[PDB]
Amino acid sequence: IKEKGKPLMLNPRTNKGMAFTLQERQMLGLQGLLPPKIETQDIQALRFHRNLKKMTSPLEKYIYIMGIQERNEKLFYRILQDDIESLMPIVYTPTVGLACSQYGHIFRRPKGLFISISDRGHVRSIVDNWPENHVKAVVVTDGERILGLGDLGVYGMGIPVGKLCLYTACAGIRPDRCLPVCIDVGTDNIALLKDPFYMGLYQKRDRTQQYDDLIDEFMKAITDRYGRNTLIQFEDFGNHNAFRFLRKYREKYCTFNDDIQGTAAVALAGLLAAQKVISKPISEHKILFLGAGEAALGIANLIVMSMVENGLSEQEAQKKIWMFDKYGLLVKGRKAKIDSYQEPFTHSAPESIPDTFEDAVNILKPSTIIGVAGAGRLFTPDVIRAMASINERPVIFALSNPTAQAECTAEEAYTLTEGRCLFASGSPFGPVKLTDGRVFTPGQGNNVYIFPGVALAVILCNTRHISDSVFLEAAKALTSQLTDEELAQGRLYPPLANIQEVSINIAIKVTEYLYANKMAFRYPEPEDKAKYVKERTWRSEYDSLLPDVYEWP
Amino acid sequence: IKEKGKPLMLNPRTNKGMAFTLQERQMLGLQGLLPPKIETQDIQALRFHRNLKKMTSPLEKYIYIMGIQERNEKLFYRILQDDIESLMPIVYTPTVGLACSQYGHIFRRPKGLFISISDRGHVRSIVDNWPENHVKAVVVTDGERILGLGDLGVYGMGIPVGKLCLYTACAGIRPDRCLPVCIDVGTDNIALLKDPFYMGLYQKRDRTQQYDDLIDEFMKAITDRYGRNTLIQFEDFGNHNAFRFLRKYREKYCTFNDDIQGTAAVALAGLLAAQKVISKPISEHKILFLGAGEAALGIANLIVMSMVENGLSEQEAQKKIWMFDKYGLLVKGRKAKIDSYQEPFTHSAPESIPDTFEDAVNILKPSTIIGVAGAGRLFTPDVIRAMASINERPVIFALSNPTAQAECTAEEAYTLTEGRCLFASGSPFGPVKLTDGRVFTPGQGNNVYIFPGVALAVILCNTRHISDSVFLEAAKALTSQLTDEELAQGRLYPPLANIQEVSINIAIKVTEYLYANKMAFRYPEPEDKAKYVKERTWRSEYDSLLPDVYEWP
Amino acid sequence: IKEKGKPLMLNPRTNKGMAFTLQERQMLGLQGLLPPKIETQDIQALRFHRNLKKMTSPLEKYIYIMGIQERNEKLFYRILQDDIESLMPIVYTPTVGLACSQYGHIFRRPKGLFISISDRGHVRSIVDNWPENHVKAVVVTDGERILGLGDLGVYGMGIPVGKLCLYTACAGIRPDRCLPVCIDVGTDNIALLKDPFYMGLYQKRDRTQQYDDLIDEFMKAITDRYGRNTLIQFEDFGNHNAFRFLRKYREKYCTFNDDIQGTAAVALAGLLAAQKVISKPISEHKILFLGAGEAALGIANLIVMSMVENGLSEQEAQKKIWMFDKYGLLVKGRKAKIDSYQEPFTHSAPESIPDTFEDAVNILKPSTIIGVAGAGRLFTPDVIRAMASINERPVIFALSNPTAQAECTAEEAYTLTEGRCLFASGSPFGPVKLTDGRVFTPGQGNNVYIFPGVALAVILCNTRHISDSVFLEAAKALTSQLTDEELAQGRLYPPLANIQEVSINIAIKVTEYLYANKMAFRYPEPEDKAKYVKERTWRSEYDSLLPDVYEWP
Ligand SMILES: NC(=O)c1ccc[n+]([C@@H]2O[C@H](COP(=O)([O-])OP(=O)(O)OC[C@H]3O[C@@H](n4cnc5c(N)ncnc54)[C@H](O)[C@@H]3O)[C@@H](O)[C@H]2O)c1
Ligand SMILES: NC(=O)c1ccc[n+]([C@@H]2O[C@H](COP(=O)([O-])OP(=O)(O)OC[C@H]3O[C@@H](n4cnc5c(N)ncnc54)[C@H](O)[C@@H]3O)[C@@H](O)[C@H]2O)c1
Ligand SMILES: NC(=O)c1ccc[n+]([C@@H]2O[C@H](COP(=O)([O-])OP(=O)(O)OC[C@H]3O[C@@H](n4cnc5c(N)ncnc54)[C@H](O)[C@@H]3O)[C@@H](O)[C@H]2O)c1
Ligand SMILES: NC(=O)c1ccc[n+]([C@@H]2O[C@H](COP(=O)([O-])OP(=O)(O)OC[C@H]3O[C@@H](n4cnc5c(N)ncnc54)[C@H](O)[C@@H]3O)[C@@H](O)[C@H]2O)c1
Ligand SMILES: NC(=O)c1ccc[n+]([C@@H]2O[C@H](COP(=O)([O-])OP(=O)(O)OC[C@H]3O[C@@H](n4cnc5c(N)ncnc54)[C@H](O)[C@@H]3O)[C@@H](O)[C@H]2O)c1
Ligand SMILES: NC(=O)c1ccc[n+]([C@@H]2O[C@H](COP(=O)([O-])OP(=O)(O)OC[C@H]3O[C@@H](n4cnc5c(N)ncnc54)[C@H](O)[C@@H]3O)[C@@H](O)[C@H]2O)c1
Ligand SMILES: O=C([O-])C(O)C(=O)[O-]
Ligand SMILES: O=C([O-])C(O)C(=O)[O-]
Ligand SMILES: O=C([O-])C(O)C(=O)[O-]
Ligand SMILES: [Mg+2]
Ligand SMILES: [Mg+2]
Ligand SMILES: [Mg+2]
């Protein structure tokens, strides 16, 4: 580092607090600016964990923990590192959604880069304003589809901020190499538009060509400063834009859309674990999605990709997938429009056309039900019992977020199906003890199990473009870590507590994969990928800031 | 110092070059950015002296020495400290004059603060731009009367730059507590106006109320940022303005005029010493100046002041002084105009009116002749032979600078009067050996003998305004240091080799005087003035940049 | 740019002098710190050229131009650009060697990075100390074979500084992306060892493994901070080490040796041109080198590379080349040893063994004579007259530097062979007018025609390793720019005045080549190489530093 004195205390990337040794203190000119006591990170964490236990509401705790990050980065990740399983719900879903829902009211210090449509033509001057000079990963949003909460405009910057947090907390990507970005083109949320605390532009969402230049000007400005192979992960964009931007840049830049492909990998991994227990014939497999958007279409494809790879032709596989959106079942010739991506899963209409999802479930008789509408409890007990009746061991995936927008709860799933089902939820749900003593621990089908390890590998391997197979592999690497004993208690995914090692494990297998497919451009090719990855992960342990002083002979 | 790395080297105020000890190098991040050798200031000064010897021209030497000032401040002053008497003619008169004459051609790096009439109304933003926060001394010019060279416009910034050099070199005034300023309101110098290299406004001198308001705004802006008692020394302004500004601000700010008052002190000191060898009766004294501007009136003033303190009434004192300017003898009722300041020295015309200065010397028959017209060799051999005939020991002062503007040379003074005369010149002149073997070492009547010492006192004493009697006392304190032996060799002033110690001794005498007259506001009053002063002179030895590291009990 | 105020003027990479516009002065906090005048780069260079035309000696000039670089970088390259042909001899051979010869005496401000054997184990800390964080090209030396001046220790940093100047002055490589490095491991020059001004370690050259460790620690340190394909150009190392390191790193890093491969490329281009005038049958070709080190071996091998490319087998190619070193002709069975590299040109002794070069010339009767011993005038008139007698059109190359160590002069060559020869020198020589009115313009066989454009292409194409074919192509690309009429005046090389375009042209021909050979890794591959290259060349014109201020809708 190049600065000394107070500036080392103000910069959270360098600030250690009373953890600065007396040498550093005296040496860097901090002596007298800190109390005579010299703490350890151990104690600093203690003070936090003790102060946090006294808090009552999650948003109060979210404001607290996120405030460390703007104070002392290393202690902040040490805090997360100490108990990820418990800080997850606060720093990530569901509390992150409640946070964005009132970002402008709890705003203290700003985080991330902000790019509004009012800066069109100068997106590069802004980019150049970012303090970090070696960014490797960018997570971008326009806040049109923030979780299942809809259009939150600029109030949505809490999403990329919380995702990049997991980048470091789970895969150990360097914090100073990540960059959260929020593109402000207006908002259609009228409540926000009449809110004095709104942080974005007081205008409705611009949907013209002006919008497309902007993302273009952005993509180009970013790569022009940080490199052509900078990882750019699109997050929570509208359905229309997510797909068109993914198809627009996936081959131009190193980009991927978490909501489309990240979600695919995790659901496929969970579905894969489920087959481990059901061992049902690939032929008698039938899946019905609640929703036909980004996630549904992404999961659908990756699933067909696993089927193809397992025999079933692309066609015979797609015929195993049905989708039910806000207008009903996707069937050929329906009044409601079907897009390019849906075509493949739109079939000739069944005998009777379902009016309700419970109808679809009874007409189709699916073996798997995956909710991805973000519309609420659409998996009524009638739907669940329906499934429980149709399937000895039905697979129910309630993946919408946050919790309030989930299709159903761990509670209802297990209870209504009498502990026969295979439950998975996008948001956290506690274990479920049944009258008859049995206890089920539900897994969390969240992309957070994929995107950190998959971003690690892509960065470390200097990959140029992310192919969809990479996510097929990352799904296998994930489900390859589920133990028969973890499987034993209802978990379709490895314990969240072990997410850091799982991530790392995924990143390794994925790099191995990239190199093996001539997709990794880092030279030379490490002989031992495992060692290559672990040797490169960022640690939260304070680093010495003392000058290199040595004697001359 | 609060910086580290390359910046310490870029800043000449902190730069040591190869003198940065190895520890400083490693601790301040300079290791690798400097050659493996660790020199001593002593070696550094050798390199310089070794190099300067190879140089043929003074301007080439000036460009070189002034260049250390913009590279290594400590080394630069060390260099001057090494041999002030030989470096003076270069860094100062006469070489400075020649440097100013083409400042625009030899420009490398800018020095000082520049304020042009075009910045009117914003002078304070400019002042706030100065990097140094605790200025205590300012030397300012508008370049209208640069030495005897006339209006040189912004090319005259070399003057304030050199006066402040001799502030530190002679009196040990901190270099970062000094600020040379240039007020560019245009120039009347046709040549510079048609010169592509000129550094100021291409416009005739602004002599409207716009100018007076600029000076005012400057005086205010400066004191507003640094203090009401900040020392402002006016240098080389036009006759009219010099007086106008001095009367206007001498009681408002802590300011003085060097050309008027600094000159007066030195011509008095010299005149005092001369009287020691002559011991002529006060009644018989009769002085005649060649010139009647700033210096002549400033000296005529202090002379009269002495005479009054030694009997004579101010009225009869004045009557012993005569003046002869570009239009001839100042006499009551002459056609050319006399002003407020010259009226006391404009007398009823003599029996015959002198056409030339030689005529004056013969009609008037003065004991002392003080040249200060800045017009060249006006003290013709005849003027000289005339004086030696009129007086046994004539007193001849050729004070105009630079050397080419001087009224005569030592060589002419001594040889033409047969070593009888008592000479002093404004510019440097070497010893003169007469054919009869006698060797006379002329003294230099230059205000550099006065301003550095007076400035240090006024600063250290937190004095608010500088009265004329303070320059009277600085004259006594200067003459009181001339030894009989030095007097014996024709020196009317202490060797210039001892200018540093002469200056500090004058500093102490003036401080003693200030506190004695209730004009010093520094509390508490230092019991021992002498030590108080020497205790606070800036030294040229490299200081340590290492931090204050020490173990804890 | 992230800094305002004085720091912008101190940093030469940003400083514009009086070239800062009034808007920038006011906006960046420089108003008042610069004279009221606003100059253009055009007048700034005018002042320089005018000031320089007054200087008498080249070292005094070299000191003046190199100081501009430490004051205002863009103006420095502007003056260079203005007349490269005239400033070449000063900023480069022969004045650069003269400067090096007494680097410690003319030392003003440090340039480049220094790494001594005493920093072994902390080389990374030294590199981390370098202000620029995006270096792409490095020119490193140990001052062991500085030109034909031998061991100059650290006084040799002048060389890597000057080479990196031609990088920018000729191929428009960004100055801030270049890093000159000097490795001080001691020196054997006793004259330096007892020199009080010497800037390195007062110890004899360390030649143990500790030396190999250091070079290795540097190689890693460098790539660690700036990337695995950072260009590292070894310059003027000892014969043994030059080859040792080339063989050792050429495949691990992106490195090359200027003295070895550079010279090869430039001599082959000159030879090639000469073959255009001679048309001699490949069969009848016979080459004899004066010297058998870095340069000779490097040229020898590239010559062979070309003959084999045109029929001749490697074996019969080598048979055409003879070398005469300080011990005499390299023949099989001689007492003076022969290394691995010379083995190929160490033939069975001729009839009569030559004791002098003149003998070798008359024994062997070569068609081409290439002096590269740096031992002085060894191409005696007798040696020349002999060549003119043996060959109607003899090819004489006096490639040693500086001019004093050159084998012979242009005048000697042309005059003694009566304008029949084909001359090329490694140092500048004026045209030669023969008594019969004929005027010859000798070419300059200096690698300066090669290393810039080649470095540009390698940098631009992100090449990982530099093959020897690259230099073959660079030779063709260079000789392909010589014009009939240019040849017509005896030029075996394009005029030096066009050195910039030539470089760029060679740069493009090489990247086209790199790409065509799958040796460039910059993604994606530009369709039009020409535009791609001119697109990215650093320009000497001042860039605006004004922030991007724009109105919001
Ligand atoms: N768990 C994870 O890893 C993860 C990842 C990404 C998105 N999600 C969640 O998935 C939900 C939807 O996101 P998306 O990207 O698929 O959105 P989208 O807007 O692209 O698609 C939503 C789909 O659900 C349909 N729908 C809406 N209301 C419906 C209703 N009442 N009945 C039936 N269908 C209805 C819509 O027609 C649409 O096809 C969000 O709540 C989001 O939080 C979860
Ligand atoms: N001050 C600076 O600008 C600076 C300082 C140190 C290193 N660097 C860069 O780092 C590279 C040196 O290679 P290396 O050993 O660091 O990695 P590497 O070459 O093994 O890995 C390849 C890429 O992965 C990135 N990377 C490695 N670990 C990362 C992590 N934990 N989180 C996010 N990104 C990570 C690297 O930046 C690199 O571009 C050089 O290309 C250099 O430009 C820059
Ligand atoms: N970083 C800073 O801003 C800084 C640092 C050290 C001291 N100071 C100032 O210095 C004063 C401390 O008292 P002191 O004992 O040094 O002085 P002092 O009280 O004995 O002297 C009186 C005045 O003369 C000035 N002075 C002393 N030596 C000087 C010199 N060699 N050249 C030019 N001016 C000189 C002082 O600034 C002071 O204003 C305080 O007023 C303080 O504000 C400021
Ligand atoms: N040695 C020192 O310490 C010192 C200090 C200040 C000024 N000076 C020198 O004194 C000279 C004048 O400065 P000033 O401030 O008195 O200037 P000024 O402009 O105030 O006055 C100059 C006077 O000289 C007169 N004059 C000009 N030419 C004359 C001539 N040819 N014959 C007779 N009289 C003539 C003018 O009429 C005018 O009255 C300058 O050359 C200056 O360098 C020396
Ligand atoms: N502040 C910074 O750290 C910063 C700022 C701007 C650009 N960059 C870097 O520059 C690259 C952007 O692409 P580009 O259009 O500059 O080049 P490019 O991608 O077309 O060229 C490929 C390589 O050539 C280098 N290069 C280009 N011109 C050069 C020149 N004139 N002299 C020396 N090297 C030159 C680049 O550094 C790059 O690594 C990115 O890799 C980015 O990391 C870094
Ligand atoms: N013009 C260019 O572009 C260019 C480039 C690189 C080197 N050079 C010059 O080439 C010269 C040598 O460089 P190098 O790297 O080849 O050196 P080197 O030390 O590797 O080889 C020098 C050779 O000259 C021989 N030699 C020495 N004295 C001799 C003598 N008196 N008679 C016959 N042979 C003698 C040595 O035996 C040795 O074989 C230097 O003067 C250098 O300036 C020129
Ligand atoms: O961000 C997320 O956690 C997920 O992609 C979602 O939208 O639910
Ligand atoms: O500047 C001086 O040294 C003096 O006041 C003069 O004007 O000659
Ligand atoms: O560096 C040079 O100028 C050249 O390679 C030489 O050694 O003569
Ligand atoms: Mg999301
Ligand atoms: Mg003056
Ligand atoms: Mg060389």
PDB file of C-alpha atoms in Angstrom, chain C residues 7 23 43-44 79 94 110 120 134 193 202 231 298 308 323 327 334 337 381 389 391 460 470 476 488:
ATOM      1  CA  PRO C   7       1.399  17.450  -7.586  1.00  0.00           C
ATOM      2  CA  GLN C  23      -9.683  26.140 -17.731  1.00  0.00           C
ATOM      3  CA  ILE C  43       6.352  27.419 -28.560  1.00  0.00           C
ATOM      4  CA  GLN C  44       7.631  25.144 -25.836  1.00  0.00           C
ATOM      5  CA  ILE C  79      11.233  17.424 -29.269  1.00  0.00           C
ATOM      6  CA  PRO C  94      27.553   7.670 -29.447  1.00  0.00           C
ATOM      7  CA  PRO C 110      17.192   9.024 -10.755  1.00  0.00           C
ATOM      8  CA  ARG C 120      18.518 -10.662  -2.656  1.00  0.00           C
ATOM      9  CA  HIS C 134       0.709  -1.547 -15.710  1.00  0.00           C
ATOM     10  CA  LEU C 193      35.652   1.031  -7.430  1.00  0.00           C
ATOM     11  CA  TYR C 202      31.791  -0.938  -4.247  1.00  0.00           C
ATOM     12  CA  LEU C 231       8.307  -8.104 -22.269  1.00  0.00           C
ATOM     13  CA  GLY C 298      23.377 -13.814 -33.407  1.00  0.00           C
ATOM     14  CA  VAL C 308      18.560 -22.572 -45.506  1.00  0.00           C
ATOM     15  CA  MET C 323      34.864 -16.036 -37.361  1.00  0.00           C
ATOM     16  CA  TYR C 327      42.698 -15.361 -30.290  1.00  0.00           C
ATOM     17  CA  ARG C 334      42.942 -24.521 -31.940  1.00  0.00           C
ATOM     18  CA  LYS C 337      38.546 -22.770 -26.714  1.00  0.00           C
ATOM     19  CA  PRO C 381      43.166   0.474 -44.662  1.00  0.00           C
ATOM     20  CA  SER C 389      40.944  -5.891 -54.403  1.00  0.00           C
ATOM     21  CA  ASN C 391      35.747  -8.026 -54.416  1.00  0.00           C
ATOM     22  CA  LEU C 460       0.122  -5.658 -28.824  1.00  0.00           C
ATOM     23  CA  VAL C 470      10.153 -13.352 -35.576  1.00  0.00           C
ATOM     24  CA  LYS C 476      12.494  -8.789 -44.287  1.00  0.00           C
ATOM     25  CA  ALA C 488      20.810   4.453 -55.174  1.00  0.00           C
TER      26      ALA C 488
END
